[PDB]
Design an enzyme around this catalytic site. Sequence first.
Site, PDB file in Angstrom:
ATOM      1  CB  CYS A  13      37.667  -8.583  50.798  1.00  0.00           C
ATOM      2  SG  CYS A  13      36.612 -10.052  50.684  1.00  0.00           S
ATOM      3  CB  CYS A  16      34.565  -6.964  52.799  1.00  0.00           C
ATOM      4  SG  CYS A  16      35.334  -8.375  53.616  1.00  0.00           S
TER       5      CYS A  16
END
Length: 89
Positions: A13, A16
């Site tokens: 991700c 993130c």
Amino acid sequence: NTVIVLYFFAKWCQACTMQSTEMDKLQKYYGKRIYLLKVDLDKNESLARKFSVKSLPTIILLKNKTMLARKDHFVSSNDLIALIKKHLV
Ligand SMILES: [Cl-]
């Protein structure tokens, strides 16, 4: 008792990476007033399904049996501080 920051992330991700560094800011700000529970979704699939995680990052803020707020996207440390204050003041 104390505010739990349940934080679902993954290494794939993109958001993130910054979310994780924003969580560092948040911890510095609150110290032991906040407890960061950093959860790798790839290592905790059943926990993820339990909280119906469909997007990353997912940030869930809890205090004493009640959920304050939940975000299924990136949230800066500053904005996290704001709605923590918003919900507890
Ligand atoms: Cl699990």
